[PDB]
Amino acid sequence: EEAELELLRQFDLAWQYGPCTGITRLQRWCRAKQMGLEPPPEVWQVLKTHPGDPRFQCSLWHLYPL
Amino acid sequence: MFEARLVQGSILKKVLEALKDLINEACWDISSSGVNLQSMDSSHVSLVQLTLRSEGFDTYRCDRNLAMGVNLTSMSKILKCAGNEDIITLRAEDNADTLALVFEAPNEKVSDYEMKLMDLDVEQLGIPEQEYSCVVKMPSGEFARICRDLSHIGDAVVISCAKDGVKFSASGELGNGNIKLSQTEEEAVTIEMNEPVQLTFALRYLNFFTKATPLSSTVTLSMSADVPLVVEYKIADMGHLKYYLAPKI
Amino acid sequence: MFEARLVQGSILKKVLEALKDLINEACWDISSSGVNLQSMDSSHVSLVQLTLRSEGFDTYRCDRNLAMGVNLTSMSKILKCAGNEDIITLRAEDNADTLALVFEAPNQEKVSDYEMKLMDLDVEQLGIPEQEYSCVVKMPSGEFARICRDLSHIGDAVVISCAKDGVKFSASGELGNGNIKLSQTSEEEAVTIEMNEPVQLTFALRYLNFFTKATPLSSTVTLSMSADVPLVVEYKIADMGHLKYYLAPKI
Amino acid sequence: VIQICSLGLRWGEPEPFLRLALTLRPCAPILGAKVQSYEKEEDLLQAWSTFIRIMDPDVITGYNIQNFDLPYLISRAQTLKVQTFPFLGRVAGLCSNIRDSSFQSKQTGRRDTKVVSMVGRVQMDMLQVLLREYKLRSYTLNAVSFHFLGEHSIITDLQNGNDQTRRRLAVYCLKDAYLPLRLLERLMVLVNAVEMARVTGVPLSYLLSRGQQVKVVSQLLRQAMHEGLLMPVVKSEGGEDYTGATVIEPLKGYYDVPIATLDFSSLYPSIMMAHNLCYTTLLRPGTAQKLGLTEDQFIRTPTGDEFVKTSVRKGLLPQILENLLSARKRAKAELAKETDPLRRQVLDGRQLALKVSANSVYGFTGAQVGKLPCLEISQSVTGFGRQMIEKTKQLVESKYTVENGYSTSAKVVYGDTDSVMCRFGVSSVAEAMALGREAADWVSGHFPSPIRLEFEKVYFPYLLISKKRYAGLLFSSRPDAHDRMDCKGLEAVRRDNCPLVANLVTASLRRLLIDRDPEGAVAHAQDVISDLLCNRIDISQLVITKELTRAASDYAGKQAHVELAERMRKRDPGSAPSLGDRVPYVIISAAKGVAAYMKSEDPLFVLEHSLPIDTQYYLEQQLAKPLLRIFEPILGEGRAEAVLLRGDHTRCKTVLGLLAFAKRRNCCIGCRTVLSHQGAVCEFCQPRESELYQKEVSHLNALEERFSRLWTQCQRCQGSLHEDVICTSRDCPIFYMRKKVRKDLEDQEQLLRRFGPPGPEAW
DNA sequence: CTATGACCATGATTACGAATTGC
DNA sequence: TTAAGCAATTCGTAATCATGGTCATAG
Ligand SMILES: Cc1cn([C@H]2C[C@H](O)[C@@H](COP(=O)(O)OP(=O)(O)OP(=O)(O)O)O2)c(=O)[nH]c1=O
Ligand code: SF4
Ligand SMILES: [Zn+2]
């Protein structure tokens, strides 16, 4: 923790995985894996050792009335 | 077609003066089980729940489940054109949006009014039944004076239910004070306790809740952990009237 | 440690109801003689002397010559929260600058325990003269209030003529002149105009309305006047002591 | 400070020549601009100071650079210990400093600004130019860019990310830094500033700091050296007021026969010109005596003074006024040959400025707190004004009458201190125009020169409500049929109200004056009130704005906007309204009826926290009384009952801590009877179900069509079709109108799942 | 157990300041 | 040391004044 919260914030702004501020984080991870762009096997291995926490399993701007 | 007839119009006038300040619009759910109502206040803080059971109306007739939309100010103005001894009948169609009220004096004078209803798009809410753990049954006059007397000091009040009795405290810029009450027919204060309670509620809502004091002699206060305080009144072989208010955090 | 009780306690409600419209503050002098209050008015025309002996109380403990100050109208708003049959109890610590009021019930089931904070006071204090009052009148308080209020709807200030046979309450106004005459009546409803030498004086009728705020405060009202001196109206607080309102006269 | 972005041009060339952007992390290249990157902020501030020394610009502009940008840079350079930053000026050994200043007048109000010292260079913040010249509703860059052209915590994670995010941030910053240049060259700011400095004779820094006194002092001194006079110093605190202008009593109502308007042009400067009024020719009451020559040596005024004829002296204020009048005449002669509309209004702005200068010459005389007051002159001016307008009204109503061979005796309906609205009688616009031109040219021949009356318009029809409140339709020629409406004073040009009310007043006067159909007007006002009560009106139409003036007058009595401003937020005690700006608010519903200052809230706070709206406040306090102003004079008091009955057929249709403890009782779609079970239809109203499904799928169909038109408009206003939209612009109707249709669709989609599915889905 | 006016409570009228626009 | 003028209409808040519903106690 506090290092796992920057890896996800770095996965969320890389443009080669998609334009993602409307959906979940694991849905975008599996969308890129289907098309197989290059999802890395570390943004998966922190979404498995946690429960349904809203500060891991949510996009950066999931507040913010946009 | 709906038609009811009730001999004690005074009960109707007391219930309509319970609510004309807290609520401006309501929907009456007319059924074959009685006349039942739920509403929120205008401030979106408190809940009212009113039940007039079907038996206590001394001449009942309801064909089909209705829903009437009533502006409570115009109805409260109409029900003060009827003295305290009259006999009140309600007449409604199942195709119309206009209600008829006929007041029958117990002596040569009969009166009849027609009032236009309105269509409203409100949503109906309710309550679930759980066991509140502090159960107070107290005189209504003492509760009215206690709320009205603490009101001049400050605006919150803390209710403190302990073993032998309950204790109400309130503060403000001109100081603070409490009132005790202890276990010792209707002038008694019966106190059932399993877990002790201490909670805080604002006074403007309580001074709204104590407007319906002529409906009964005693009042029932129910408390539990972190739930909305319930204020309950009973109307004799007619039904009941409940207000609901949430605690401060 | 001051701790005092009063069973027929409606009198305190009654005095502070007739105190708060006059003045905004009071200099409460607690001595071993009891509870006293000398205080001027706000308009520099009048004065209140309240004396409450200890023998008019029930149960008493005074260990200090306390000299405190009360903001009156907030204390009256607190006194509005207790009935008249209810027992009034006061408690005071000579280091803790607060007043602890205890309202007991006659059925003892409702207990009240209120607290008002203190504020400092440097109030002026003058002594009344003692002299001969050429006219002392014993009157019913309700009739007196009725008469001066009946004069309030004519004009503003009253002229009084105090003599042997009758007494003459006259006034002018925007509708003209009027006057009512009284005489002695040959225990509470009895009147008496005890007189040596007849006089004429000017007084303010609005301050008579202010002074008749203590109408339910006694058996009889006493009206004491002489030449060019403060009128003292007296309400004898029954079995307790007395309240005297001084009004410096007009020119 | 993480990014600085700069644009530079030579004046006269239609594009810039320099485009630079300096960032603080490594970035990605932008076509058309240079990009440099640094790993520390000291290098960034040093690089900007060296660039600003080497390019050496004449003028520095921006938007809110005075009160935000330059003191932020100066304080940030002081904190990080960089010694060589604050030398931005032209003199080689001088450092710059922050200094407060205030300005106040009854014309622009009071404003408090900081200044930063730059010797040699000139500053033009475009915000201060807008706030001084223009009277608008919001003064944000988005609002004035829409009005003239047509358009913090997210940025901190666009900068802590990657370098294409930083490239997006730099393109945004460069568009921001480019907009005030376009506004400066499009609005003809600098050309008018240079012409103002050449006509008045004051420097170019005084037209951004001072008022209208230094210019008239300057022109009077420049005219005083040519005859050898010296100015005195009189100062007095304080004289009394004098009597201003007359207004003629109306004949109120609705007119449908044409009224022609005749007015005087440049009234007070021509009074001061053609009766030889000046400081330097004011005759004291004794110095006429004991000479007795009254005739053609002096004159007498209605207030009482005596003033010398022009055969002895020429005043100084006639000559200054004559120069200003010729400059404005040349500006109008240039304006009479434009075809573009925005260019036509900016030349109108130039001539408006020169007329304001000429009238402030007269207003200099009566200012008892000033530098040289002579209230005798002011009284003579307004006395001559009153005398001449009553002369106009007597003459116009007296000559053209039934006995004098004409058709109908005319009757004046209105006059306000420079104009006369005479009602002639004919209902043909050609004959009214002909007689009105004859009347203007006839009456003008009873005066000295340059006093002239002129025809200006014909109103047909006309609507007169009170003093300083009227409306009409505008005719310039006859075969030029009609131009527009005129709304003098009414509820459509003031800014103290809601957009909903001003829009309703404009649409009602449109349907009522152009098409002459009161039934569509009643149906329109009914639909507005019905859609108000049914809770389908956007919150853009509900926002009220008020100006936060000096704090002691707002100490004297409790207001709504002052209460909202002085109540800080928990989020930000560092961004709040200051003195001089505008506070926006809406009114929410509560039960504290003694105070409308206890129900006011920020629009963004009621957005994010979802508080309800007081529809009865907006119904009886905002809407109702302007409508009763407008709709009554065409009919009687059965018209008040007609609109209050239009309301009455439509008032009976209203839409609706403890809120979490819901039960969510279902209800019959046909007859609204709460009942156990989830089926949509009631057992008595079960047959009629195909019609009840038919009804409401044409509502889902129309919500679907509104979702798509809005959420793809943001993609075209943003620029890109492949990346996310981030624009929470509070001055755009687009924002928060795109937020509620998501919830309408969320609700209306779930109401139709009460009905089953129209088929399987797992086959 | 029942008249009478004194007492509390709620609504109609006036006054004045603030804001903004027309000449 | 610094600042162009007057006329008029509209709306909100607190204070002033009118009037009825309870009530409290003397008959
Ligand atoms: C607008 C305005 C008018 N006035 C006075 C002077 C003017 O002579 C008089 C007439 O007002 P305006 O008609 O507004 O101005 P104007 O007549 O001088 O010029 P034009 O007809 O070409 O538009 O009102 C002022 O003193 N100060 C002002 O700001
Ligand atoms: S909300 Fe959409 S349309 Fe409105 S300003 Fe923002 S991007 Fe443009
Ligand atoms: Zn049904």
PDB file of N, CA and C (backbone and C1' of nucleotides) in Angstrom, chain D residues 210 212-213 241 244 363 369 467-468 596-597 625 629, chain F residues 2-14:
ATOM      1  N   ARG D 210      -7.236  55.798 -13.887  1.00  0.00           N
ATOM      2  CA  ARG D 210      -7.830  57.050 -13.447  1.00  0.00           C
ATOM      3  C   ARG D 210      -9.255  57.179 -13.971  1.00  0.00           C
ATOM      4  N   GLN D 212     -12.401  60.389 -15.149  1.00  0.00           N
ATOM      5  CA  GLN D 212     -12.673  61.376 -16.172  1.00  0.00           C
ATOM      6  C   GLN D 212     -12.330  62.797 -15.748  1.00  0.00           C
ATOM      7  N   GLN D 213     -11.541  62.981 -14.683  1.00  0.00           N
ATOM      8  CA  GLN D 213     -11.186  64.331 -14.243  1.00  0.00           C
ATOM      9  C   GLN D 213      -9.856  64.793 -14.817  1.00  0.00           C
ATOM     10  N   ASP D 241     -27.607  70.000  -3.076  1.00  0.00           N
ATOM     11  CA  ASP D 241     -28.030  69.554  -4.389  1.00  0.00           C
ATOM     12  C   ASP D 241     -28.830  70.658  -5.074  1.00  0.00           C
ATOM     13  N   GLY D 244     -32.735  68.558 -10.826  1.00  0.00           N
ATOM     14  CA  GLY D 244     -32.407  67.938 -12.094  1.00  0.00           C
ATOM     15  C   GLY D 244     -33.463  68.086 -13.167  1.00  0.00           C
ATOM     16  N   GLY D 363     -20.617  67.458 -16.496  1.00  0.00           N
ATOM     17  CA  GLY D 363     -20.719  66.904 -15.152  1.00  0.00           C
ATOM     18  C   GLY D 363     -19.554  67.240 -14.244  1.00  0.00           C
ATOM     19  N   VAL D 369     -17.515  67.553  -4.702  1.00  0.00           N
ATOM     20  CA  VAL D 369     -16.278  66.905  -4.293  1.00  0.00           C
ATOM     21  C   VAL D 369     -15.497  66.665  -5.580  1.00  0.00           C
ATOM     22  N   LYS D 467     -43.171  55.429 -15.737  1.00  0.00           N
ATOM     23  CA  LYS D 467     -42.019  56.244 -16.084  1.00  0.00           C
ATOM     24  C   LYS D 467     -40.805  55.334 -16.208  1.00  0.00           C
ATOM     25  N   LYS D 468     -40.041  55.520 -17.294  1.00  0.00           N
ATOM     26  CA  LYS D 468     -38.832  54.750 -17.629  1.00  0.00           C
ATOM     27  C   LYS D 468     -39.115  53.260 -17.847  1.00  0.00           C
ATOM     28  N   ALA D 596     -35.723  35.009   3.384  1.00  0.00           N
ATOM     29  CA  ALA D 596     -35.244  34.476   2.119  1.00  0.00           C
ATOM     30  C   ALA D 596     -33.729  34.502   2.019  1.00  0.00           C
ATOM     31  N   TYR D 597     -33.044  35.040   3.025  1.00  0.00           N
ATOM     32  CA  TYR D 597     -31.595  34.980   3.123  1.00  0.00           C
ATOM     33  C   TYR D 597     -31.117  33.757   3.890  1.00  0.00           C
ATOM     34  N   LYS D 625     -45.693  38.852 -10.592  1.00  0.00           N
ATOM     35  CA  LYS D 625     -45.912  40.290 -10.712  1.00  0.00           C
ATOM     36  C   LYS D 625     -45.405  40.970 -11.992  1.00  0.00           C
ATOM     37  N   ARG D 629     -47.838  43.096 -14.509  1.00  0.00           N
ATOM     38  CA  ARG D 629     -47.555  44.380 -15.158  1.00  0.00           C
ATOM     39  C   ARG D 629     -47.926  44.351 -16.632  1.00  0.00           C
TER      40      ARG D 629
ATOM     41  P    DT F   2      -3.244  61.631  -6.201  1.00  0.00           P
ATOM     42  O5'  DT F   2      -4.800  61.265  -6.190  1.00  0.00           O
ATOM     43  C5'  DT F   2      -5.205  59.965  -6.556  1.00  0.00           C
ATOM     44  C4'  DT F   2      -6.682  59.748  -6.300  1.00  0.00           C
ATOM     45  C3'  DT F   2      -7.622  60.679  -7.051  1.00  0.00           C
ATOM     46  O3'  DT F   2      -8.132  60.015  -8.196  1.00  0.00           O
ATOM     47  C1'  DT F   2      -8.333  60.193  -4.801  1.00  0.00           C
ATOM     48  P    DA F   3      -8.723  60.858  -9.423  1.00  0.00           P
ATOM     49  O5'  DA F   3     -10.288  60.597  -9.337  1.00  0.00           O
ATOM     50  C5'  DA F   3     -10.782  59.287  -9.217  1.00  0.00           C
ATOM     51  C4'  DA F   3     -12.195  59.304  -8.676  1.00  0.00           C
ATOM     52  C3'  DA F   3     -13.091  60.372  -9.273  1.00  0.00           C
ATOM     53  O3'  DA F   3     -13.739  59.865 -10.409  1.00  0.00           O
ATOM     54  C1'  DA F   3     -13.352  60.228  -6.892  1.00  0.00           C
ATOM     55  P    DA F   4     -13.839  60.735 -11.746  1.00  0.00           P
ATOM     56  O5'  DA F   4     -14.969  61.822 -11.445  1.00  0.00           O
ATOM     57  C5'  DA F   4     -16.346  61.474 -11.505  1.00  0.00           C
ATOM     58  C4'  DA F   4     -17.167  62.672 -11.929  1.00  0.00           C
ATOM     59  C3'  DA F   4     -18.646  62.619 -11.602  1.00  0.00           C
ATOM     60  O3'  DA F   4     -18.877  63.113 -10.290  1.00  0.00           O
ATOM     61  C1'  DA F   4     -18.364  63.227 -13.843  1.00  0.00           C
ATOM     62  P    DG F   5     -20.201  62.705  -9.477  1.00  0.00           P
ATOM     63  O5'  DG F   5     -21.402  63.440 -10.232  1.00  0.00           O
ATOM     64  C5'  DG F   5     -21.864  64.691  -9.762  1.00  0.00           C
ATOM     65  C4'  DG F   5     -23.043  65.195 -10.579  1.00  0.00           C
ATOM     66  C3'  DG F   5     -24.404  64.721 -10.118  1.00  0.00           C
ATOM     67  O3'  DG F   5     -24.904  65.587  -9.121  1.00  0.00           O
ATOM     68  C1'  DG F   5     -24.219  64.515 -12.482  1.00  0.00           C
ATOM     69  P    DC F   6     -25.939  65.050  -8.022  1.00  0.00           P
ATOM     70  O5'  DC F   6     -27.343  64.965  -8.792  1.00  0.00           O
ATOM     71  C5'  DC F   6     -27.977  66.136  -9.300  1.00  0.00           C
ATOM     72  C4'  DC F   6     -29.191  65.779 -10.163  1.00  0.00           C
ATOM     73  C3'  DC F   6     -30.387  65.174  -9.411  1.00  0.00           C
ATOM     74  O3'  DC F   6     -31.616  65.697  -9.920  1.00  0.00           O
ATOM     75  C1'  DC F   6     -29.738  63.733 -11.147  1.00  0.00           C
ATOM     76  P    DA F   7     -33.007  65.427  -9.154  1.00  0.00           P
ATOM     77  O5'  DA F   7     -33.705  64.256  -9.989  1.00  0.00           O
ATOM     78  C5'  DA F   7     -34.358  64.556 -11.233  1.00  0.00           C
ATOM     79  C4'  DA F   7     -35.094  63.344 -11.798  1.00  0.00           C
ATOM     80  C3'  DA F   7     -36.164  62.739 -10.893  1.00  0.00           C
ATOM     81  O3'  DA F   7     -37.318  62.410 -11.658  1.00  0.00           O
ATOM     82  C1'  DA F   7     -34.583  61.089 -11.485  1.00  0.00           C
ATOM     83  P    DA F   8     -38.734  62.145 -10.941  1.00  0.00           P
ATOM     84  O5'  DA F   8     -38.874  60.540 -10.902  1.00  0.00           O
ATOM     85  C5'  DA F   8     -38.885  59.789 -12.120  1.00  0.00           C
ATOM     86  C4'  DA F   8     -38.637  58.315 -11.865  1.00  0.00           C
ATOM     87  C3'  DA F   8     -39.470  57.712 -10.729  1.00  0.00           C
ATOM     88  O3'  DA F   8     -40.274  56.609 -11.199  1.00  0.00           O
ATOM     89  C1'  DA F   8     -37.214  57.025 -10.621  1.00  0.00           C
ATOM     90  P    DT F   9     -41.499  56.020 -10.322  1.00  0.00           P
ATOM     91  O5'  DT F   9     -42.018  54.785 -11.180  1.00  0.00           O
ATOM     92  C5'  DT F   9     -41.162  54.171 -12.117  1.00  0.00           C
ATOM     93  C4'  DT F   9     -40.432  52.981 -11.525  1.00  0.00           C
ATOM     94  C3'  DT F   9     -41.226  52.146 -10.523  1.00  0.00           C
ATOM     95  O3'  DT F   9     -41.599  50.912 -11.124  1.00  0.00           O
ATOM     96  C1'  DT F   9     -38.910  52.365  -9.948  1.00  0.00           C
ATOM     97  P    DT F  10     -42.678  49.940 -10.433  1.00  0.00           P
ATOM     98  O5'  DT F  10     -41.794  48.794  -9.756  1.00  0.00           O
ATOM     99  C5'  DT F  10     -40.744  48.195 -10.482  1.00  0.00           C
ATOM    100  C4'  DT F  10     -39.815  47.427  -9.565  1.00  0.00           C
ATOM    101  C3'  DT F  10     -40.500  46.544  -8.515  1.00  0.00           C
ATOM    102  O3'  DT F  10     -40.229  45.176  -8.756  1.00  0.00           O
ATOM    103  C1'  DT F  10     -38.696  47.793  -7.593  1.00  0.00           C
ATOM    104  P    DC F  11     -41.128  44.043  -8.058  1.00  0.00           P
ATOM    105  O5'  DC F  11     -40.290  43.609  -6.767  1.00  0.00           O
ATOM    106  C5'  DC F  11     -38.989  43.073  -6.915  1.00  0.00           C
ATOM    107  C4'  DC F  11     -38.261  43.011  -5.586  1.00  0.00           C
ATOM    108  C3'  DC F  11     -38.991  42.264  -4.467  1.00  0.00           C
ATOM    109  O3'  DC F  11     -38.108  41.338  -3.910  1.00  0.00           O
ATOM    110  C1'  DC F  11     -38.217  44.350  -3.690  1.00  0.00           C
ATOM    111  P    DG F  12     -38.650  40.045  -3.144  1.00  0.00           P
ATOM    112  O5'  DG F  12     -38.009  40.201  -1.690  1.00  0.00           O
ATOM    113  C5'  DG F  12     -36.600  40.270  -1.575  1.00  0.00           C
ATOM    114  C4'  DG F  12     -36.158  40.779  -0.215  1.00  0.00           C
ATOM    115  C3'  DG F  12     -36.826  40.137   0.988  1.00  0.00           C
ATOM    116  O3'  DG F  12     -35.847  39.873   1.950  1.00  0.00           O
ATOM    117  C1'  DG F  12     -37.059  42.490   1.089  1.00  0.00           C
ATOM    118  P    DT F  13     -36.064  38.743   3.058  1.00  0.00           P
ATOM    119  O5'  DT F  13     -35.921  39.547   4.431  1.00  0.00           O
ATOM    120  C5'  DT F  13     -34.813  40.417   4.617  1.00  0.00           C
ATOM    121  C4'  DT F  13     -35.053  41.388   5.757  1.00  0.00           C
ATOM    122  C3'  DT F  13     -35.797  40.817   6.959  1.00  0.00           C
ATOM    123  O3'  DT F  13     -35.041  41.063   8.141  1.00  0.00           O
ATOM    124  C1'  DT F  13     -36.776  42.858   6.242  1.00  0.00           C
ATOM    125  P    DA F  14     -35.380  40.310   9.519  1.00  0.00           P
ATOM    126  O5'  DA F  14     -35.793  41.509  10.486  1.00  0.00           O
ATOM    127  C5'  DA F  14     -34.985  42.675  10.538  1.00  0.00           C
ATOM    128  C4'  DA F  14     -35.779  43.863  11.036  1.00  0.00           C
ATOM    129  C3'  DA F  14     -36.562  43.613  12.316  1.00  0.00           C
ATOM    130  O3'  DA F  14     -36.211  44.603  13.280  1.00  0.00           O
ATOM    131  C1'  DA F  14     -37.963  44.584  10.639  1.00  0.00           C
TER     132       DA F  14
END
